[PDB]
Symmetry: D4
């Protein structure tokens, strides 16, 4: 299926299992993929046949910046649920939530979770 | 199937939903993948058994620089249509059109659309 | 002289000569360097003998996000003025304001202004 | 299936076919992917429904830093075996072990092995 | 199937359709993937159960540096053929040949061909 | 002195000592630095008290794309001469001309020339 | 004067003003420059006429990993003091201590302090 | 003074204090800067009034690939000596020799030496 992507959104948030993380905050990154037909939009040049990617950005920002969860899994799950609830034309989405600066002693680029969700 | 790629073509264009975007312009990037047999070319060293990637670059440039659409979907769709019309030996293509600097308040690397097209 | 740096701050702002830029906005980046004696702080481990770099970040954010100028020159000048007014222990500063996505048809990484300021 | 990732872990280790490599050591990098249901965790915000990625990091560190094998294949195989033994909720994993600085005269970014493992 | 990778080999070669390219030369890059069982190697720590990646590097170097073809397709095809001829334990390979600096007026990262080959 | 920068302009051009380079062309990059007082502009927000960096970009583009020289030295020298002739308020400039893909068999990022010029 | 550099050392440490930082830890990076005559070493090929850069690395690691300070200023100051105390042949050093993931809500690459020290 | 640069030359070499390094080899990188008047060349377009940067590359390659020293200091010193001996028009040079993959247990980008040399 055709795809809309938003790559490497960066937010500052307060999610985390440790209370110290909830106090200090840290970077969170999100990669978004949504699956939908884009042919009608590409033939007509009419945005009403697609999904406004500015709205998709704001949907992600709300989950990461305006809420606080323990788990990155909860960020991913809530983004996916909100997308499918709000956009009937999107059949499936893949949400990757990245924690690049976790409190793990060691050397690495990032930890992340990734889920793919569709309706029943 | 075997593939020809052109990675991260960069164009300056005027596409966009907002009239201000049509006035100012911005960067657009394109990733191209085309699927075709390359074995006859790889065995013969004869370009007539493949597709000249310089021509593929120019085909993309024409759509992005010489036309102006509202939607990135229209850029992708027109590139794919032109490829399949001009190159009978290409069975399928995947076109990703990237808008790295959209007028979205926030922090991210890029927004993009991606389509895969083949003939009926 | 010793230095505090903040590298590659990224803000979304509305500065620009063209009215279309003031409507759409774009990325702005800032590099900050301030010059001050750090030896008293490095020997005592007491932040009172240095300058809190979180405050320096917020000072830059206010100029870039909470105001709108025509010129990147005005962003740099106002950041430098605010630093010298507020931190008597800083003797000089260098402020670089970067516009990575200006409305210039062409291929480049960024345009920028850089100033160094001290008191009379 | 949903995934947890740890990207680009960097370790210093002593693995290698040549005895000189066992003496000098070199960088080793690991990419980890584990497959498991994350929906129960994303709905409950309860870490007991997922796998702690700090533990996954430490499991990898033990294999790369606390043991010495001739082959990168042995690093990958032991990481995969340990994951599946310790985490019943993980159904499959993909482990990539990267040797970026091998003693190969030439110019390249890295050599690597990658395996995917599941239970019988 | 398990994989051995060699990422981003860089060679200087003389391949090209235009005689001027055959005179001047340019960079060529190769990504190699070979598919084979690695479990016996990962369990035994015995290199005789795998394929020496230094030999794979040299096989690629020979094709790119010691021969001159018109087409990048010929580079890819000859590398794949040599791999399958020399290593009975490799069941399939994917060879990507990248020309990052072709004589195409325009702005892009690279052009490339990619083939996957197995025995009849 | 205060500075305006344009970083990493990329042009496709035909400069070079070898006739084959003049036929095929290649990438050329330019870094520009100009020195001028920016305080009047930063205090007034009036572009008339600075130098329009879009004009500086076009000045460089003309030299690199609309002319063909043997030497990168000639590109740099002509850019600097044109800047000083056209902008009396610029007291000095530093021009770096980069050839990232020269016909040199070997492994490197780029070759370059850099000059600093002012009036007698 | 001639220089030895160590670029972008990465350590995990517990420094910081906030108690939560001392509990969680974070990445710290260090750039080291030391100034000394290298001509005797370059003519003789005898390490006794230079300074072993592996020892310089370990000196930095001890300060960043084996101690905990409130300020990055204290890390830099102690590294510089230890270098000058231990290596009479080094006449001056520049130490840059980088905190890439501080608890500052915002978007940036890093904050840092940099000092240059010599003997009275 | 005007400059010619060659950035990030990469060679495979066998230099090192430990005998194991002389057996295995590793990457070495070199940055070259030479200072000379470029105005005569930039005005005349005649390479005879400059220094051929392809010759400078080969001069560096000979030292790094065709000789083996214990110290990176010796690589830098010999490159600088050869440049000044062979090019009377070069008045000064700065040579940086980088060892990105030394046998130092730890996490860093590279170690390096840098020297600046001129004639008596
Ligand atoms: N699966 C999963 N595992 C985790 N482990 C630890 C933490 C902590 O908040 C810190 O990131 C590291 O200790 N968070 C998570 C998490 O969100 N998901
Ligand atoms: N799917 C889709 N959504 C869009 N939303 C907004 C805009 C605007 O032109 C700007 O990019 C952002 O407001 N363009 C698009 C677009 O082309 N495609
Ligand atoms: N020195 C200087 N020159 C400029 N030229 C054009 C623009 C416009 O806003 C756009 O960035 C490009 O047309 N801004 C500036 C500016 O701030 N400073
Ligand atoms: N498949 C495989 N091949 C190898 N070839 C050589 C070496 C040596 O230790 C050095 O990396 C290079 O000579 N290691 C390996 C290895 O682990 N796996
Ligand atoms: N498929 C394919 N197309 C090509 N087109 C042009 C050239 C020329 O040598 C230059 O790269 C560009 O004109 N080479 C190729 C090639 O190898 N393969
Ligand atoms: N100083 C200087 N040296 C050069 N050497 C060779 C070439 C050739 O055109 C190719 O770039 C490499 O052979 N150009 C130059 C040049 O412009 N400047
Ligand atoms: N000069 C200087 N300023 C600082 N401000 C805040 C913090 C805190 O530990 C956090 O990094 C940010 O709040 N540390 C420092 C510091 O070490 N140095
Ligand atoms: N100044 C200087 N110090 C060194 N220390 C160790 C080694 C060894 O060969 C390895 O690189 C690291 O142990 N080489 C050097 C060197 O060339 N220069
Ligand atoms: Cl919808
Ligand atoms: Cl065709
Ligand atoms: Cl489990
Ligand atoms: Cl085999
Ligand atoms: Ni319609
Ligand atoms: Ni034929
Ligand atoms: Ni005090
Ligand atoms: Ni439960
Ligand atoms: Ni066996
Ligand atoms: Ni005025
Ligand atoms: Ni001696
Ligand atoms: Ni002459």
């Amino acid at each position: 299926m055709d795809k809309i992507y938003i790559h490497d959104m960066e937010f500052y948030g307060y999610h985390g299992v440790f209370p110290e993380e909830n106090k200090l905050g840290q970077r969170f990154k999100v990669d978004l993929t949504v699956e939908l037909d884009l042919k009608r939009a590409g033939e007509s040049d009419d945005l009403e046949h697609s999904v406004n990617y500015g709205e998709l950005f704001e949907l992600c920002r709300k989950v990461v910046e305006d809420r606080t969860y323990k788990l990155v899994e909860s960020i991913a799950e809530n983004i996916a649920t909100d997308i499918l609830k709000q956009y009937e034309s999107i059949s499936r989405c893949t949400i990757k939530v990245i924690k690049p600066d976790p409190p793990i002693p060691g050397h690495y680029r990032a930890v992340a979770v990734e889920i793919t969700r569709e309706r029943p």
